[PDB]
Design a protein around this ligand. Structure first.
Ligand SMILES: [Cl-]
Ligand SMILES: [Cl-]
Ligand SMILES: [Cl-]
Ligand code: NA
Lengths: 259, 253, 253, 257
């Protein structure tokens, strides 16, 4: 099943879509600068692009740690991004009450992995009618993803993306099961599956650029709707060379018939 | 470090406290009936007991599963439980705005495992000044619990309980690391540690729950936590082992 | 099912048996000294005891690392141990051809965890007719132990002990699933199950840790405990025996 | 570091080499027929190919399941494969005593995963001077492979291949950590790394084997290790077309600096 996001077709047999941007919104000017770099790189390579950022860091290490611009200012920044670049955007939501005002502006709304079983958040997200990105928790198996999908379907929204971010592997470590992508496709109605390579790696001794590339290449080899990543996270200047490689592999894989 | 909860002393060197009740509050009459059974069994054995229920469950198996009676009626029910039986009570909260009004009534407030890193909720819970039960997520290592504890401390509350519920073990299965109890004690200032045996098992039976409860309580724990006369036979065995363990001094040096 | 090892009764409802000793045999004098200490401690506490050692270290970090005394000399030392102390002994075997000469001397022969799927070794061990200790590999689940047991039964030997040593948990770490003991008892005809606490901890082995883990496992009702280790052994065994006596005095439910 | 195996170059920046064949040698005629099919398909696609089988399977489902034809007859069959097709062959050894007679005939000898820490076998294999395939145990982390390599190096043999077969993931399940390939290359001197997709999948089908094989080969590997009967033997060509496409793309691009 494909999902249309403005003029973008997202699907497991379509050219991969990049979901990329930054961890947290800090200011309008920095955001526009970072976004302009993603837009020019992706446009030249012919890769469909959706700009990603959080307006709030909800689970920071300290109560005193900087958390970002917040809802009202964050939505102002997203409105400016869409106006300036004409691209879709994606952000996460952590409270039911935020879903409607966020969905008015943001094309895709994201369910945080830690909140995937917050049933009132699922319902509030579903009711927006927006495209939803479901972050697969590290503690949930790929065959249990269908239970989250079921909830969104019972609540009347079928425009769902499934986002791999790795699986718990002993203490404080993650592994990405390359077979989990296929399990999700087979058991969740072939909804678009995307791969968050960045968060999949957060527990490895260097977020290495070579590591991220090997892991991204491996996952895309399984035939995926998209790649989800952050830069500052990959350094922003290496983005073009990274994406050249991803696109070469995706174009190859997508050109071969399924069987 | 011990925590006093009315007349109960909760601590890793104290007789174990049982936390148990029902999943979701439905009515005063049904609640009182179930609570009266736990109270009668625990009184008969002399085991300190704290009644547990949810008034508004946000993590339900289905989206239209009953959440519970809700805040206003749930707190009325909890008041009546406390008045009738003279025991403390425990409930979970998932919205920051609920923490204050809940804490007026409920002796212990519980942080759901899935929300354990949600800073706004941790702060709102801390600020109640109530005793807080911190449910350990299945994805978190025992040495990371200190970071949650640190956030509660920054927010001004040190009356914290750590609740083990198992760890992710490949797909679906949970395993309980019996060494994790000691790691939490060592790194978190010897706060009371309790063992939620039920959740630890839902991914795997009475004989199982008994082996696993006994193994955990052998490590010297403040309490045992159950989720949704067999209860009596079970508690007799747990109390035997607890009484033996707690009567012996901790290992020399 | 119980197993008789000379005058010792080994079984999951019998007083626990300690299997202990040293890693690798280095000399007669140092072996007799270590064995005498275990004997003195176990005798004064009233705990049945089987002396353990390897005659060959088959996994050395270096090709030039010292291997131990080897078969011929090792069996001489075991014969001296049995003669001086009148106790049973246990050793591992890594090659089929070693099984018969080792079994002439050693009461219990042990199948190393890495070799548990070496079918020719299983057969050669079974054909000795000796009591066998089957080390559960860290990569095998408890419900797969019945397949190893089946092989020994087909080869004509039912005097089998199942020995827990933990399960692989991420990279370079182990966890012990306390539910795995009950699985093995239920699926393998209630053969004696013992717990190797020492090898279960290789990857973490503090004294307080070893004690918590040993207590937790023995709380599930086991035939024995298997270890390599100011009076640490006696302090440890006093606690284990207290718990084992309590658990074994309660009827199975 | 590359390894030459007769006229084949094996290395992490060379075209992938296929190691394939069957589980246990059972008969000469059937072995030759199977091998002929691998040969014809791989020659057609220009893929370097090494025929694999066990002559003495030591880890059997039952004690009386057939172990295979045994050493003497198994080596005769391997000699016939080499003579008829002019390709290298690979087999496993489980006992120190078997290392010499197997190494005299077989171009690669293989260290079974479960025996990977058995020092006497490692020494005996090393001393043959033969190319060695080291199967990574499911319980060993990728940064511990260097310790096995070290033992071979101490014993005088550096012609070593590292073979991924997955990692224990909870009970009875395996996961392949796609980052482990790079850890092995970085810590073990960039020895050839190959991927046993067949044994990596025991615990879970054709679509799965393909996804997993493609993912692994995307990380830039010296080879792919598989069995057929296990993959069905007639789908081999379609499978290898896909593997070869991806491998040719990857290998044609310079390593990222
Ligand atoms: Cl994110
Ligand atoms: Cl093989
Ligand atoms: Cl059999
Ligand atoms: Na050779």
């Amino acid at each position: 099943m494909d999902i249309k996001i403005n003029d973008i077709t997202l699907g497991n047999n379509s050219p991969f879509v990049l979901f990329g941007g930054i961890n947290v919104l800090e200011s309008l000017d920095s955001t526009l600068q970072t976004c302009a770099h993603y837009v020019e790189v992706t446009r030249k390579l012919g890769i469909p692009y959706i700009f990603k950022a959080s307006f709030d860091k909800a689970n920071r290490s300290s109560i005193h740690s900087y958390r970002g611009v917040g809802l009202e200012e964050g939505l102002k920044i997203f409105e400016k991004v869409k106006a300036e670049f004409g691209i879709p955007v994606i952000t996460d939501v952590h409270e039911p009450h935020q879903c409607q005002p966020v969905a008015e502006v943001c094309d895709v709304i994201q369910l945080p992995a830690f909140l995937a079983k917050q049933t009132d958040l699922v319902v509030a997200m579903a009711k927006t009618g927006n495209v939803v990105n479901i972050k697969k928790p590290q503690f949930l198996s790929p065959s249990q993803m269908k239970n989250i999908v079921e909830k969104f379907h019972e609540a009347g929204n079928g425009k769902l993306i499934l986002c791999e971010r790795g699986s718990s592997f002993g203490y404080d470590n993650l592994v990405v099961d390359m077979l989990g992508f296929g399990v999700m496709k087979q058991t969740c109605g072939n909804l678009p599956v995307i791969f968050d390579v960045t968060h999949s790696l957060q527990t490895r001794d260097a977020g290495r650029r070579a590591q991220a590339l090997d892991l991204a290449l491996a996952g895309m080899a399984t035939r995926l709707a998209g790649l989800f990543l952050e830069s500052h996270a990959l350094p922003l200047h290496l983005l073009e060379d990274f994406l050249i490689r991803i696109k070469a592999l995706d174009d190859l894989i997508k050109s071969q018939p399924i069987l």
